[PDB]
Amino acid sequence: AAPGKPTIAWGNTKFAIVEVDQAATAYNNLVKVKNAADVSVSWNLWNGDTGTTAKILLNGKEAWSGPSTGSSGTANFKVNKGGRYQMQVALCNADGCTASDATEIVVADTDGSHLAPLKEPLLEKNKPYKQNSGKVVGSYFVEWGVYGRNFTVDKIPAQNLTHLLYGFIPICGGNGINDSLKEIEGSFQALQRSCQGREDFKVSIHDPFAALQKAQKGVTAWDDPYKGNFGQLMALKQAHPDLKILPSIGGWTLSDPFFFMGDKVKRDRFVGSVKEFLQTWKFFDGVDIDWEFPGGKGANPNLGSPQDGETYVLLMKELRAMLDQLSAETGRKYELTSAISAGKDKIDKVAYNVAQNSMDHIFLMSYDFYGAFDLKNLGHQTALNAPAWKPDTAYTTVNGVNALLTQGVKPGKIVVGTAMYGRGWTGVNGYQNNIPFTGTATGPVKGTWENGIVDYRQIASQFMSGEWQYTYDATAEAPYVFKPSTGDLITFDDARSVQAKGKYVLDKQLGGLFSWEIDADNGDILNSMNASLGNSAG
Numbered sequence: 001a002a003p004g005k006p007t008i009a010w011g012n013t014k015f016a017i018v019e020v021d022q023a024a025t026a027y028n029n030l031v032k033v034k035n036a037a038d039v040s041v042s043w044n045l046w047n048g049d050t051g052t053t054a055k056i057l058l059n060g061k062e063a064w065s066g067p068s069t070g071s072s073g074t075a076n077f078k079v080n081k082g083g084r085y086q087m088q089v090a091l092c093n094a095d096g097c098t099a100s101d102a103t104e105i106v107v108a109d110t111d112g113s114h115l116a117p118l119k120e121p122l123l124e125k126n127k128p129y130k131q132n133s134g135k136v137v138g139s140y141f142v143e144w145g146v147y148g149r150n151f152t153v154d155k156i157p158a159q160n161l162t163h164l165l166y167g168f169i170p171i172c173g174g175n176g177i178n179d180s181l182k183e184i185e186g187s188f189q190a191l192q193r194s195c196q197g198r199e200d201f202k203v204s205i206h207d208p209f210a211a212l213q214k215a216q217k218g219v220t221a222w223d224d225p226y227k228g229n230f231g232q233l234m235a236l237k238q239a240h241p242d243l244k245i246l247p248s249i250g251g252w253t254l255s256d257p258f259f260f261m262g263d264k265v266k267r268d269r270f271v272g273s274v275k276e277f278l279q280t281w282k283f284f285d286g287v288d289i290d291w292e293f294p295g296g297k298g299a300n301p302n303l304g305s306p307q308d309g310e311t312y313v314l315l316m317k318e319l320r321a322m323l324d325q326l327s328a329e330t331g332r333k334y335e336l337t338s339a340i341s342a343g344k345d346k347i348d349k350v351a352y353n354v355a356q357n358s359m360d361h362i363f364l365m366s367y368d369f370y371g372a373f374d375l376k377n378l379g380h381q382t383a384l385n386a387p388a389w390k391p392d393t394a395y396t397t398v399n400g401v402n403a404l405l406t407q408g409v410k411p412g413k414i415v416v417g418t419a420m421y422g423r424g425w426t427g428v429n430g431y432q433n434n435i436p437f438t439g440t441a442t443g444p445v446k447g448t449w450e451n452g453i454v455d456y457r458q459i460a461s462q463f464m465s466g467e468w469q470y471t472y473d474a475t476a477e478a479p480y481v482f483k484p485s486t487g488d489l490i491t492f493d494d495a496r497s498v499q500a501k502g503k504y505v506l507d508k509q510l511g512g513l514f515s516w517e518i519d520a521d522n523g524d525i526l527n528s529m530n531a532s533l534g535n536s537a538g
């Protein structure tokens, strides 16, 4: 007779090719990349002959075999490809093979091959669009947004984007390297802990809990190898295999290390760390460099050098040569992008007409033109054009785009920025002709999360009734609201100014639109990005 039918023993059924150590705070110990998951299966035979060979089958295919020597057995073996597999134990002799019922096992890998797709309904005012314009539609999701802002990856309207950027991946370094972090309580210390034992100028993860461990929809079981933003982004990639998910390195507070990269030793180390990061976290499709800014005038008043333009171009060229090696190894297309100042004074510190040859997209940061950081000179923070009362206004979207075009940047590379937030002032006074921007302020407006800044959701929700005036400036293409009794003035993007930007993008053959930051929209802003670029509804 053939052998008795074995019963699979109860035991762990989730294993990982890239393992996350659940009690480690240092990135180097937290993440263990293996060539294959170490899988274990045990079985008992309660009736009959145990056979002479025992096999572990994954979807019918043998992963292990050995002699069947008793009523219970254990197999330890390696599986080098992620997925959910119907595992069976089979006992075989000369008279045939008898297979157990199947038990599903998980062999996790960071492409999310082991995850059910994260396909979540659109929330708030988001309406469905098809990505058929061939234009970029991007937004940034922030790692720390899962706490107070309570905005998680399952809340992203992912069908309505071509690009989803993850803010932000830090670069390791302590004193003198990441001093701008010190302005945020605990932030510099969290980075030193993540980077313990790791060389400076290598990338890391700033908050490994939020990235890998915090329970979230789809990744809530204790034994799920990946949880947090990264586990959900893996599942999101399964739902949206054409969405480009880019890790963004830098931003306002994490840009200091770039200013050292004129040293090719550091720059090589950084580039090699990026390659390793993309080999480790397979759901990412490239890299976004948000260096704020070559030449300085970013967060750190002690950094900035005339050499920065040359460093920027060398960095983009070497990142591209690294991505072309990675693309060759994997067959995938990887993108290289950068978010850049939209101010002509910062733009002309870099030869973008040379760097564009390495890059897929330039994310033009056509926002933060004005704000509570200057109480004396007020203006539209994200306007397309200058306003009628000051046509020589330096900081407008069109001035930034024209600066690039005059360098010789191809229009199709340029992605125009929209704000999902307003900036504002309180106590505005001394203005003429009913134009509050001609006055001066005494402070920042009360903000949603920080002074001087309000989520677009809150503007739409809270500041469109009672005493608040609303005006759409059609020369600048820019809405604002004003409460004259307190002098509260807020400058923002809305559906209409976004429509004007999209129209302009199409008119000038630019690359598309992107936004900061996705948690702050109620749907209005992203809906308008999609519609104005000509994406079809549905």
Ligand SMILES: CC(=O)N[C@H]1[C@H](O[C@H]2[C@H](O)[C@H]3N=C(C)S[C@H]3O[C@@H]2CO)O[C@H](CO)[C@@H](O[C@@H]2O[C@H](CO)[C@@H](O)[C@H](O)[C@H]2NC(C)=O)[C@@H]1O
Pocket: 140, 144, 167, 168, 184, 187, 206, 248, 250, 251, 252, 253, 254, 290, 339, 365, 368, 421, 449, 450, 453, 516, 517
């Ligand atoms: C108003 C706002 O959202 N500010 C955040 C600031 O955002 C700027 C970006 O860094 C620039 N890069 C882009 C890409 S778009 C562009 O503009 C936005 C808005 O001006 O980013 C900071 C990080 O660089 C944010 O800091 C975060 O602040 C919260 C507390 O407010 C804190 O909990 C986070 O730890 C801190 N994150 C980091 C990495 O420092 C700021 O919120």
Ligand SMILES: CC(=O)N[C@@H]1[C@@H](O)[C@H](O[C@@H]2O[C@H](CO)[C@@H](O)[C@H](O)[C@H]2NC(C)=O)[C@@H](CO)O[C@H]1O
Pocket: 251, 252, 292, 340, 341, 342, 343, 365, 367, 368, 369, 370, 373, 395
């Ligand atoms: C036109 C111009 O150069 N405006 C400056 C602002 O850019 C800058 O604010 C900063 O803008 C960045 C995007 O270009 C943001 O990344 C950043 O969060 C923001 N910094 C702050 C503190 O809001 C300010 C610097 O305060 O100066 C303006 O002149």
